[PDB]
Design an enzyme around this catalytic site. Structure first.
Site, PDB file in Angstrom:
ATOM      1  CB  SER A   1       6.231  -5.250  -7.385  1.00  0.00           C
ATOM      2  OG  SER A   1       6.440  -5.659  -8.725  1.00  0.00           O
TER       3      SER A   1
ATOM      4  CG  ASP B   1      -8.080   6.781  -1.095  1.00  0.00           C
ATOM      5  OD1 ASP B   1      -7.201   6.078  -1.610  1.00  0.00           O
ATOM      6  OD2 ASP B   1      -7.857   7.835  -0.468  1.00  0.00           O
TER       7      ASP B   1
END
Length: 330
Positions: free
Chosen positions: A199, A35
Protein backbone atom coordinates in the site's frame (compact mmCIF):
# COMPACT_ATOMS: atom_id res chain seq x y z
CA UNK A 1 -15.68 -21.29 -17.78
CA UNK A 2 -16.74 -19.03 -14.97
CA UNK A 3 -18.28 -19.33 -11.54
CA UNK A 4 -20.22 -16.93 -9.30
CA UNK A 5 -21.27 -17.57 -5.69
CA UNK A 6 -22.77 -15.44 -2.97
CA UNK A 7 -20.81 -15.12 0.25
CA UNK A 8 -22.67 -14.30 3.47
CA UNK A 9 -21.52 -12.94 6.87
CA UNK A 10 -21.71 -15.58 9.61
CA UNK A 11 -22.99 -13.09 12.20
CA UNK A 12 -23.97 -9.46 12.76
CA UNK A 13 -20.34 -8.35 13.04
CA UNK A 14 -19.08 -9.84 9.76
CA UNK A 15 -16.65 -12.01 11.75
CA UNK A 16 -16.24 -14.17 8.66
CA UNK A 17 -18.05 -15.03 5.47
CA UNK A 18 -19.38 -18.39 4.25
CA UNK A 19 -19.86 -19.50 0.68
CA UNK A 20 -21.71 -22.68 -0.39
CA UNK A 21 -19.56 -25.32 -2.07
CA UNK A 22 -20.77 -28.52 -3.72
CA UNK A 23 -18.58 -31.56 -2.99
CA UNK A 24 -19.00 -35.06 -4.36
CA UNK A 25 -21.62 -36.97 -6.30
CA UNK A 26 -24.40 -36.54 -5.47
CA UNK A 27 -23.49 -33.03 -4.32
CA UNK A 28 -22.91 -32.43 -0.63
CA UNK A 29 -23.20 -28.71 0.02
CA UNK A 30 -20.95 -27.29 2.73
CA UNK A 31 -20.55 -23.64 3.73
CA UNK A 32 -16.86 -22.81 3.49
CA UNK A 33 -14.73 -19.86 4.58
CA UNK A 34 -12.94 -18.70 1.45
CA UNK A 35 -9.47 -17.75 2.65
CA UNK A 36 -6.97 -15.90 0.42
CA UNK A 37 -4.49 -16.30 3.30
CA UNK A 38 -4.18 -20.11 3.15
CA UNK A 39 -4.11 -22.87 0.57
CA UNK A 40 -5.92 -25.93 1.94
CA UNK A 41 -9.50 -26.93 1.18
CA UNK A 42 -10.53 -28.77 4.31
CA UNK A 43 -13.85 -29.88 5.69
CA UNK A 44 -15.61 -31.22 8.71
CA UNK A 45 -16.37 -34.81 7.80
CA UNK A 46 -17.64 -38.21 8.85
CA UNK A 47 -14.05 -38.81 10.02
CA UNK A 48 -13.96 -35.83 12.42
CA UNK A 49 -13.71 -36.74 16.12
CA UNK A 50 -17.37 -36.74 17.16
CA UNK A 51 -16.90 -34.56 20.27
CA UNK A 52 -15.30 -31.92 18.03
CA UNK A 53 -18.36 -31.56 15.79
CA UNK A 54 -21.07 -29.21 17.08
CA UNK A 55 -23.62 -28.33 14.41
CA UNK A 56 -21.45 -28.21 11.30
CA UNK A 57 -22.47 -29.92 8.09
CA UNK A 58 -20.07 -32.78 7.35
CA UNK A 59 -18.65 -34.28 4.16
CA UNK A 60 -19.11 -38.07 4.04
CA UNK A 61 -16.78 -39.43 1.32
CA UNK A 62 -18.32 -42.92 1.53
CA UNK A 63 -21.57 -41.44 0.12
CA UNK A 64 -19.80 -39.87 -2.88
CA UNK A 65 -19.31 -42.02 -5.97
CA UNK A 66 -16.51 -39.76 -7.22
CA UNK A 67 -14.55 -39.68 -3.95
CA UNK A 68 -11.16 -41.41 -3.99
CA UNK A 69 -8.85 -41.74 -1.01
CA UNK A 70 -5.52 -40.13 -1.79
CA UNK A 71 -3.40 -42.96 -0.49
CA UNK A 72 -0.95 -42.05 2.24
CA UNK A 73 -1.69 -38.32 2.19
CA UNK A 74 -2.18 -36.34 5.39
CA UNK A 75 -2.48 -32.67 6.22
CA UNK A 76 -2.08 -30.45 9.27
CA UNK A 77 -2.45 -26.69 9.48
CA UNK A 78 -2.02 -23.94 12.08
CA UNK A 79 -3.54 -20.51 11.49
CA UNK A 80 -2.44 -17.05 12.60
CA UNK A 81 -5.18 -16.94 15.23
CA UNK A 82 -3.84 -20.10 16.86
CA UNK A 83 -6.52 -22.42 15.50
CA UNK A 84 -5.64 -25.71 13.79
CA UNK A 85 -6.92 -28.86 12.07
CA UNK A 86 -5.58 -32.06 10.54
CA UNK A 87 -6.61 -35.25 8.79
CA UNK A 88 -6.40 -37.26 5.59
CA UNK A 89 -7.20 -36.50 1.93
CA UNK A 90 -9.66 -37.46 -0.75
CA UNK A 91 -9.99 -36.26 -4.28
CA UNK A 92 -13.50 -35.44 -5.45
CA UNK A 93 -15.55 -33.16 -7.66
CA UNK A 94 -15.88 -29.64 -6.26
CA UNK A 95 -18.09 -26.91 -7.69
CA UNK A 96 -18.33 -23.25 -6.69
CA UNK A 97 -21.10 -21.10 -8.16
CA UNK A 98 -21.38 -23.33 -11.23
CA UNK A 99 -17.63 -23.75 -11.78
CA UNK A 100 -16.54 -27.39 -11.49
CA UNK A 101 -13.14 -28.92 -10.71
CA UNK A 102 -12.65 -32.67 -10.96
CA UNK A 103 -9.98 -34.34 -8.86
CA UNK A 104 -9.78 -31.54 -6.28
CA UNK A 105 -7.98 -32.46 -3.06
CA UNK A 106 -10.60 -32.36 -0.31
CA UNK A 107 -8.85 -32.49 3.02
CA UNK A 108 -10.98 -34.39 5.50
CA UNK A 109 -10.62 -33.36 9.13
CA UNK A 110 -9.94 -36.00 11.77
CA UNK A 111 -9.20 -33.32 14.36
CA UNK A 112 -10.14 -29.64 14.67
CA UNK A 113 -9.27 -27.10 17.37
CA UNK A 114 -11.93 -25.75 19.73
CA UNK A 115 -12.48 -22.47 17.88
CA UNK A 116 -13.63 -24.45 14.83
CA UNK A 117 -15.90 -26.74 16.87
CA UNK A 118 -17.43 -23.73 18.60
CA UNK A 119 -18.31 -22.07 15.29
CA UNK A 120 -21.31 -24.00 13.99
CA UNK A 121 -21.59 -21.83 10.84
CA UNK A 122 -18.27 -22.76 9.22
CA UNK A 123 -18.04 -26.26 7.71
CA UNK A 124 -14.43 -25.81 6.58
CA UNK A 125 -12.06 -23.57 4.63
CA UNK A 126 -11.37 -23.13 0.93
CA UNK A 127 -7.86 -21.73 0.50
CA UNK A 128 -7.11 -19.24 -2.26
CA UNK A 129 -3.52 -18.28 -1.52
CA UNK A 130 -0.72 -19.85 -3.57
CA UNK A 131 -0.44 -23.62 -3.73
CA UNK A 132 3.10 -23.47 -2.36
CA UNK A 133 1.51 -23.13 1.12
CA UNK A 134 -0.65 -26.24 0.81
CA UNK A 135 0.09 -28.57 3.73
CA UNK A 136 -0.67 -31.97 2.16
CA UNK A 137 2.14 -34.46 2.68
CA UNK A 138 3.96 -36.18 1.08
CA UNK A 139 2.54 -34.79 -2.18
CA UNK A 140 1.52 -31.13 -2.03
CA UNK A 141 -1.88 -30.40 -3.56
CA UNK A 142 -3.25 -27.52 -5.61
CA UNK A 143 -5.91 -25.03 -4.57
CA UNK A 144 -9.31 -24.96 -6.24
CA UNK A 145 -8.32 -21.79 -8.12
CA UNK A 146 -5.05 -23.28 -9.29
CA UNK A 147 -6.92 -26.34 -10.61
CA UNK A 148 -9.60 -24.21 -12.31
CA UNK A 149 -7.24 -21.59 -13.72
CA UNK A 150 -6.59 -22.97 -17.19
CA UNK A 151 -10.30 -23.53 -17.85
CA UNK A 152 -11.34 -20.05 -16.78
CA UNK A 153 -12.20 -17.37 -19.35
CA UNK A 154 -9.60 -15.20 -17.56
CA UNK A 155 -7.23 -16.47 -14.84
CA UNK A 156 -8.72 -14.35 -12.06
CA UNK A 157 -11.10 -14.41 -9.17
CA UNK A 158 -12.71 -11.46 -7.42
CA UNK A 159 -13.81 -10.76 -3.86
CA UNK A 160 -16.70 -8.41 -3.27
CA UNK A 161 -17.46 -8.65 0.45
CA UNK A 162 -20.48 -6.88 1.91
CA UNK A 163 -20.69 -4.72 5.00
CA UNK A 164 -23.41 -6.37 7.14
CA UNK A 165 -24.69 -7.82 3.85
CA UNK A 166 -24.06 -10.63 1.34
CA UNK A 167 -21.40 -10.23 -1.35
CA UNK A 168 -19.92 -12.24 -4.18
CA UNK A 169 -16.93 -14.36 -5.19
CA UNK A 170 -16.54 -14.58 -8.96
CA UNK A 171 -14.17 -16.88 -10.81
CA UNK A 172 -12.97 -16.31 -14.36
CA UNK A 173 -14.41 -12.85 -15.05
CA UNK A 174 -14.57 -9.25 -13.81
CA UNK A 175 -18.10 -7.93 -13.27
CA UNK A 176 -17.75 -4.37 -14.52
CA UNK A 177 -21.07 -3.41 -12.90
CA UNK A 178 -19.83 -4.32 -9.38
CA UNK A 179 -17.58 -1.30 -8.81
CA UNK A 180 -17.32 2.42 -9.43
CA UNK A 181 -14.51 4.18 -11.28
CA UNK A 182 -11.53 2.11 -12.42
CA UNK A 183 -9.66 -0.84 -10.99
CA UNK A 184 -6.11 0.10 -9.90
CA UNK A 185 -3.69 -2.80 -10.18
CA UNK A 186 -0.62 -3.17 -7.99
CA UNK A 187 2.31 -5.59 -7.81
CA UNK A 188 2.26 -8.85 -5.88
CA UNK A 189 5.06 -10.84 -4.30
CA UNK A 190 4.33 -14.55 -4.07
CA UNK A 191 7.57 -15.21 -2.18
CA UNK A 192 5.76 -16.05 1.09
CA UNK A 193 2.85 -17.82 -0.64
CA UNK A 194 0.44 -14.92 -0.07
CA UNK A 195 -1.24 -12.21 -2.11
CA UNK A 196 1.37 -9.80 -0.75
CA UNK A 197 1.40 -6.19 -1.93
CA UNK A 198 2.51 -2.70 -0.88
CA UNK A 199 0.00 0.00 0.00
CA UNK A 200 1.16 3.53 -0.74
CA UNK A 201 -0.09 5.02 2.53
CA UNK A 202 -3.04 6.04 4.63
CA UNK A 203 -5.25 8.80 6.01
CA UNK A 204 -7.39 9.02 9.12
CA UNK A 205 -10.81 10.58 8.75
CA UNK A 206 -10.58 13.80 6.76
CA UNK A 207 -6.86 14.12 7.55
CA UNK A 208 -4.04 14.53 5.06
CA UNK A 209 -2.77 11.45 3.27
CA UNK A 210 0.54 10.09 4.58
CA UNK A 211 2.63 8.59 1.79
CA UNK A 212 4.39 5.55 3.22
CA UNK A 213 4.95 2.00 2.00
CA UNK A 214 2.99 -0.63 3.92
CA UNK A 215 3.67 -4.23 2.84
CA UNK A 216 0.85 -6.62 3.69
CA UNK A 217 -1.39 -9.44 2.52
CA UNK A 218 -4.90 -9.37 1.11
CA UNK A 219 -6.50 -11.95 3.37
CA UNK A 220 -10.24 -12.69 3.18
CA UNK A 221 -9.87 -15.19 6.04
CA UNK A 222 -8.83 -12.58 8.58
CA UNK A 223 -11.57 -10.44 10.11
CA UNK A 224 -9.70 -7.25 10.99
CA UNK A 225 -7.16 -4.83 9.55
CA UNK A 226 -3.73 -5.31 11.11
CA UNK A 227 -1.23 -2.50 10.46
CA UNK A 228 1.98 -1.10 12.01
CA UNK A 229 1.63 0.25 15.57
CA UNK A 230 2.44 3.78 14.39
CA UNK A 231 -0.47 3.79 11.93
CA UNK A 232 -2.89 2.19 14.36
CA UNK A 233 -1.97 4.66 17.11
CA UNK A 234 -2.58 7.57 14.74
CA UNK A 235 -6.05 6.15 14.00
CA UNK A 236 -7.22 5.56 17.57
CA UNK A 237 -5.81 8.90 18.75
CA UNK A 238 -8.72 10.43 16.83
CA UNK A 239 -11.31 8.56 18.94
CA UNK A 240 -11.89 10.05 22.38
CA UNK A 241 -11.43 7.45 25.09
CA UNK A 242 -9.87 4.81 22.83
CA UNK A 243 -6.96 2.84 24.30
CA UNK A 244 -5.00 -0.35 23.87
CA UNK A 245 -6.02 -2.88 26.48
CA UNK A 246 -3.66 -5.78 27.05
CA UNK A 247 -6.37 -7.55 29.07
CA UNK A 248 -8.78 -7.44 26.12
CA UNK A 249 -6.09 -7.94 23.47
CA UNK A 250 -6.14 -4.75 21.43
CA UNK A 251 -7.64 -1.33 21.01
CA UNK A 252 -11.06 -0.76 22.54
CA UNK A 253 -13.17 2.37 22.35
CA UNK A 254 -16.35 3.76 23.94
CA UNK A 255 -19.35 2.30 22.18
CA UNK A 256 -20.82 5.85 22.20
CA UNK A 257 -18.09 7.00 19.78
CA UNK A 258 -18.51 8.04 16.20
CA UNK A 259 -15.57 6.41 14.38
CA UNK A 260 -13.57 8.22 11.70
CA UNK A 261 -12.99 6.59 8.32
CA UNK A 262 -9.62 5.10 7.38
CA UNK A 263 -8.21 5.45 3.87
CA UNK A 264 -5.52 3.24 2.35
CA UNK A 265 -3.52 3.81 -0.80
CA UNK A 266 -3.40 1.56 -3.82
CA UNK A 267 -0.94 3.23 -6.19
CA UNK A 268 -2.31 6.72 -6.72
CA UNK A 269 -5.83 5.47 -5.86
CA UNK A 270 -7.58 5.52 -2.48
CA UNK A 271 -9.93 3.09 -0.77
CA UNK A 272 -12.04 4.58 2.03
CA UNK A 273 -13.11 2.33 4.88
CA UNK A 274 -16.11 3.99 6.58
CA UNK A 275 -15.92 4.39 10.33
CA UNK A 276 -18.84 2.00 10.94
CA UNK A 277 -16.81 -0.82 9.34
CA UNK A 278 -14.27 -0.47 12.18
CA UNK A 279 -16.78 -1.12 15.01
CA UNK A 280 -16.80 -4.74 16.24
CA UNK A 281 -19.19 -4.20 19.05
CA UNK A 282 -19.10 -4.77 22.82
CA UNK A 283 -16.07 -6.67 24.14
CA UNK A 284 -18.51 -8.78 26.12
CA UNK A 285 -22.31 -8.84 26.16
CA UNK A 286 -23.71 -5.69 27.76
CA UNK A 287 -20.37 -3.85 27.87
CA UNK A 288 -20.06 -0.20 26.78
CA UNK A 289 -16.50 -0.89 25.68
CA UNK A 290 -16.30 -1.80 21.99
CA UNK A 291 -13.60 -3.68 20.12
CA UNK A 292 -11.78 -1.91 17.28
CA UNK A 293 -11.48 -3.24 13.74
CA UNK A 294 -8.07 -1.74 13.14
CA UNK A 295 -5.39 -3.37 15.31
CA UNK A 296 -1.60 -3.54 15.58
CA UNK A 297 0.28 -6.13 13.53
CA UNK A 298 3.22 -5.87 15.95
CA UNK A 299 3.95 -9.43 17.01
CA UNK A 300 2.11 -10.96 14.03
CA UNK A 301 5.13 -10.38 11.81
CA UNK A 302 3.10 -9.22 8.82
CA UNK A 303 0.47 -6.58 8.03
CA UNK A 304 -2.93 -8.02 7.13
CA UNK A 305 -5.51 -6.35 4.93
CA UNK A 306 -8.35 -8.44 6.26
CA UNK A 307 -12.12 -8.19 5.76
CA UNK A 308 -12.38 -4.71 7.34
CA UNK A 309 -10.28 -3.36 4.45
CA UNK A 310 -11.28 -5.71 1.65
CA UNK A 311 -15.05 -5.23 2.16
CA UNK A 312 -14.59 -1.54 1.33
CA UNK A 313 -13.37 -2.54 -2.18
CA UNK A 314 -13.98 -4.69 -5.19
CA UNK A 315 -10.80 -6.79 -5.22
CA UNK A 316 -9.27 -8.64 -8.19
CA UNK A 317 -6.94 -11.53 -7.51
CA UNK A 318 -5.22 -11.80 -10.88
CA UNK A 319 -3.62 -15.21 -11.28
CA UNK A 320 -1.80 -14.46 -14.52
CA UNK A 321 1.76 -15.70 -15.01
CA UNK A 322 2.86 -12.63 -13.07
CA UNK A 323 0.10 -12.22 -10.47
CA UNK A 324 -1.25 -8.80 -9.49
CA UNK A 325 -3.97 -7.37 -7.26
CA UNK A 326 -6.60 -4.88 -8.32
CA UNK A 327 -8.70 -2.61 -6.10
CA UNK A 328 -11.71 -0.50 -7.01
CA UNK A 329 -14.12 1.54 -4.94
CA UNK A 330 -17.75 0.38 -5.03
Amino acid sequence: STGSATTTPIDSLDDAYITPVQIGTPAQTLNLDFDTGSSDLWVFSSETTASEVDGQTIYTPSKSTTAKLLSGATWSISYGDGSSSSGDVYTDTVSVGGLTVTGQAVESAKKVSSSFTEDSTIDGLLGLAFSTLNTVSPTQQKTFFDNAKASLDSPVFTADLGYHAPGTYNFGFIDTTAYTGSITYTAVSTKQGFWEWTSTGYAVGSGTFKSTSIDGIADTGTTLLYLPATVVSAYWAQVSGAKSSSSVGGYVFPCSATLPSFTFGVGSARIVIPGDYIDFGPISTGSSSCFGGIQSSAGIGINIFGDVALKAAFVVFNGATTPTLGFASK
